[PDB]
Amino acid sequence: SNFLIPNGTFFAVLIIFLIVLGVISKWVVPPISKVLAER
Amino acid sequence: LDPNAIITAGALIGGGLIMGGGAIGAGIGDGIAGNALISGIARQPEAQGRLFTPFFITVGLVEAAYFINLAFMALFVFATPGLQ
Amino acid sequence: LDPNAIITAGALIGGGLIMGGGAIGAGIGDGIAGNALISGIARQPEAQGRLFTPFFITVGLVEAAYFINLAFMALFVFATPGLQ
Amino acid sequence: LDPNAIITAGALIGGGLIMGGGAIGAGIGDGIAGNALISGIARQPEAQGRLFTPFFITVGLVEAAYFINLAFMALFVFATPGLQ
Amino acid sequence: LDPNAIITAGALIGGGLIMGGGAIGAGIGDGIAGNALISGIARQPEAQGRLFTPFFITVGLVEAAYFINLAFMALFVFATPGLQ
Amino acid sequence: LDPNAIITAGALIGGGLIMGGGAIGAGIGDGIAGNALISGIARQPEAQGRLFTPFFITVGLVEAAYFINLAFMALFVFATPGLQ
Amino acid sequence: LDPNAIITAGALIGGGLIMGGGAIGAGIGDGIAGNALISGIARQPEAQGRLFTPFFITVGLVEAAYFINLAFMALFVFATPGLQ
Amino acid sequence: LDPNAIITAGALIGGGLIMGGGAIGAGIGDGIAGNALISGIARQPEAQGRLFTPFFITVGLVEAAYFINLAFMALFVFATPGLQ
Amino acid sequence: LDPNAIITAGALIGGGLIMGGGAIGAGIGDGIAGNALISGIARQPEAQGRLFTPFFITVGLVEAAYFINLAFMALFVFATPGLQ
Amino acid sequence: DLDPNAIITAGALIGGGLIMGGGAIGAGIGDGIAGNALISGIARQPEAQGRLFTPFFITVGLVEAAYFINLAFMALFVFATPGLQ
Amino acid sequence: AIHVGHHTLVFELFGMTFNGDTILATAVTAVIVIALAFYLRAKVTSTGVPSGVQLFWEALTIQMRQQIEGSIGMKIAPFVLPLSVTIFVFILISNWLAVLPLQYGGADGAAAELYKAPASDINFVLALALFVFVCYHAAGIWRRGIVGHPIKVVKGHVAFLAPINIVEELAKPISLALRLFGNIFAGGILVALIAMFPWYIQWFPNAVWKTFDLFVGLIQAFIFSLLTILYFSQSMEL
Amino acid sequence: DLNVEIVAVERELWSGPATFVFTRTTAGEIGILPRHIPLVAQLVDDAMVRVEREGEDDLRIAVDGGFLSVTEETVRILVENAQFESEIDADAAKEDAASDDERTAAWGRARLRALGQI
Amino acid sequence: MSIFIGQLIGFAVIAFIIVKWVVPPVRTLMRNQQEAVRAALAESAEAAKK
């Protein structure tokens, strides 16, 4: 149980991260910046 | 003597040293950074918030060493390299 | 010879190193943070309360490490990894 | 080579490390806090009354750790964990 | 007793020393540099921009040592030289 | 060999650690307190009478730790616990 | 058991000591030099370009010691003196 | 194996630790006290005679620990307690 | 086992201790001296040369001690005393 | 059947190594701190140079003293190992 | 028994292994983040009184925007603002979800958590750190050219320290991951270790450690995001 | 509460109770609270003084030739010249700032800092 | 199963501490932000009316 060797999970987790990034780079941050600019 | 006993005794000594050094470093660095922050606040009480950003950076960096060490400590005492 | 003897001797030495390093870190970090607190209270007595907010943070950031060390110290001397 | 002999030697070494670390940390931390207190009193002779309140706190947070170490050292030498 | 057992026990202790000392050094250096940075920012808030180029130079040096040690730690543990 | 020989060697190393750590702590803490005292007396010649009070307290703590360790050093090397 | 085993274990522990102390020295010295540099840049922003000339010397000098210690990784770990 | 061999080796290591700790404490404390003395004399030349009083006490305290350590080192090596 | 193996292992560990302590002392002392040199140069630029006379002296002292250790280390590993 | 002399010599070498490690740490740190004070004072008060050597040297004289004492005992540990046989 | 590692729901696919526990924890964190994002998007009040979700999101955006402006031109590297933000929240949630009381017993006397923070898994931290590494290295490539960027980093702030700079760069990703790893991995042990106590005394140390771990996780998320921003900035200069 | 006093070379400009006093000495930004230790510092060439009172808005002042003296009784700020927020005009704060003359530029920067736009 | 009870009591303590000390201040901060933005909007409306 080395628990330090990279596993296949490395890729999978990365994939999921990107999805979150995709939903935060397009549907969260731009609206927030627009709202702050409007204020 | 069973070789694995020697290996794991050496590993326990090694991990003890790992975390002894890590705790020394983390304690000293946290103390020094907190000293800087407390002195800055006492010297300018309203500056408090502005200091949290840099201070934590320092904390982070300091803690890095300690916690990085901690990881390898586990690697010494849970998956001992060179174990037979 | 019984391997467990070597296992527990190495574990005890490792836990001693754990706890010694933890004591070093805790003592020195608390001393430095307290030096900052004392100097600040001397400089700005009315900031006393406002100074405890950062000081404790520092103490926390220090004390946890010590207690973390303590925890692992127990892990060495009560459930020795790799024991056999 | 009695297992108990090896375990006792390891316990003694571990207790020695624990007390060495505790003494180093306690002595230096108390010295640093006392330095803060002495400088504060030298600058403001009458501030001493309000400088003991933080100073003692610091001393506590130092001595506590040291005394905690003490307890565990007594655990190592007398109630040696893992001793058979 | 096979030679490799003693070799690997010594190697694990050696690596423990390696990166325990590395962690102590990294913690001390990071704490000291961060204290400098926090004091500078507290005194000169507009200096935050110009206080990072030197700071992250010295930190860059400090961490270097530590990580170099880490590298050799691996060489001691995962590629133990002289290991029959 | 003789188990008591191993126990005595472990106890001697432990007590050496006791007093080495105690001496480091005492020396450094006393140096720090004395630096504070010297600076305070420099900046305030008449403060001497009112400075030795906190200074002693500082030293009183420091030496305490040291001498406490000394006592236990004796316990390690003169009435060795677990010395079968 | 063969003597090369004991000699190589001793060499590994010795090299761990060497460059662990080297890393402690390098980290602390570089941190202190960087503290000086950062404080100087904070107090005299224009002095930045002028402050490297002493700074690096210190760093270099400090680093020299570290690298000298690192040199004795080659002498100890790889080509062990007294190896038979 | 001769038990006297083990006991004497342990005593030699213990005395080495005794004197290492004593030397570290003495050097650090004396350096800090001298730093205070030199800074005080530089800031105010007139206090050259006034500062040497407290300074000596400081040094005294520091030196005491060292010499005490030395004494016990002799006890450890020349007349080893528990020798048999 | 070969007695020379034990002698050489002890000698290598001792030389590692010597060089580690020398590296710690030299690195930190050079760092402190360079810190004060950098501060002095930052306070005023014209002092550069005037400040190299004392700084060098200090570094000299520091380096000398370190180099002495080096010599003794060369004695330990190569001309191992009491090799028999 | 390892020679007792070998165990004594190994212990003596480790002990002396500790002696030098501690002595060098102390000497280096103390000299660095005293020198820091010296050069700070020189940077602030140039006219204090001749005045600042008398304390400085005292400091150094004390620091090195401890160091050299350690050196002496190191020799006694290595070349005249007490309990040697 | 501590059972360090021992990933649950581990499976195999395409000639490579996957840790079911880490995948599940990361997916749950992503679901929480997505739910918060859509709660914000549905209920954006450009003119009305903002709700808690909008307040939190705008506070995070303001903090990260301030960090970027202080470090590098906010109009030079806008893409850092989202990335940083998401990282923060991601890590934060991944840690805060551990505060729940999901640690049961497997009848062997050793604790087992239904949910384990993914940052205790080397794969999660490695993914985050290496993604940040490639991201800001590519940003430096764009901002300084394919040839200038490696040369600039090799030279560093002072040319004569060329070797150290190399190591420094190699230290940036690793330091980012292991640090985080440790800060969370230790927790996975402490709670497990606290399980060794009986309930009537286990309750208190567990409560104290989890309370502190809340702050530890928040601080680690903040540090990861801030160091990501700062590394981005150091790679986009001149 | 502590007594603040902004006093010019010619006429004392202001005096009264306050709860906090922020300014920028040559060493660095300093905040003074009631029982601050005795202190004597020099305000930065383009210093600004912000006096926070109780129940009233912060009073912001641009200072030329500053000197701060904190005493156990009261806090005093000495100015070769000083202008309040109301008595400062943005335009001349701009043309005066960015001028070649060192003192002119410093006075302009101090006026801008007192205004708030910096 | 005992460790489950221990963690449950610990989480009850954590929740009590939160709702006792952390929730009030953060709720007040949220209310302050809401009131600040509301006052800004009201001021804008009043400015247009003026």
Numbering used by the authors:
A (entry chain b): 22 to 60
B (entry chain L), C (entry chain T), D (entry chain S), E (entry chain M), F (entry chain R), G (entry chain N), ...: 3 to 86
J (entry chain P): 2 to 86
K (entry chain a): 10 to 247
L (entry chain H): 3 to 120
M (entry chain d): 1 to 50
What text does the study give?
Extensive classification of the data for the mycobacterial ATP synthase revealed the presence of not only the three main states referred to as S1, S2, and S3 but also of substates within them. Substates S1a to S1e are in S1, and S3a to S3c are in S3. In S2 (where there are no resolved substates) the c-ring has traveled two c-monomers further round (ca.120°), and in state 3 substates S3a to S3c have all traveled on to approximately the same position, four c-monomers (or ca. 280°) further on. Again, the position of the PS suggests that the order of substates is either S3c > S3a > S3b or S3b > S3a > S3c. The main differences between the substates within each state are that the positions of the PS and F1 domains vary such that the F1-domain (including the α-helical coiled-coil of the γ-subunit) appears to pivot around the PS during the catalytic cycle. However, alignment of the substates via the “crown” in the F1-domain shows that they have identical nucleotide occupancies and that the position of the γ-subunit is also maintained. Alignment of the substates via the a-subunit demonstrates that the c9-rings and the membrane α-helices of the a-, b-, and bδ-subunits of the substates are in identical positions, as are the ε-subunits, and in some instances the lower part of the γ-subunit. Each nucleotide binding site in the three α-subunits and in subunit βTP is occupied by an ATP molecule with an accompanying Mg2+ ion, while the site in subunit βDP has ADP and an accompanying Mg2+ ion. The sixth nucleotide binding site in subunit βE contains an ADP molecule with neither accompanying Mg2+ nor phosphate.
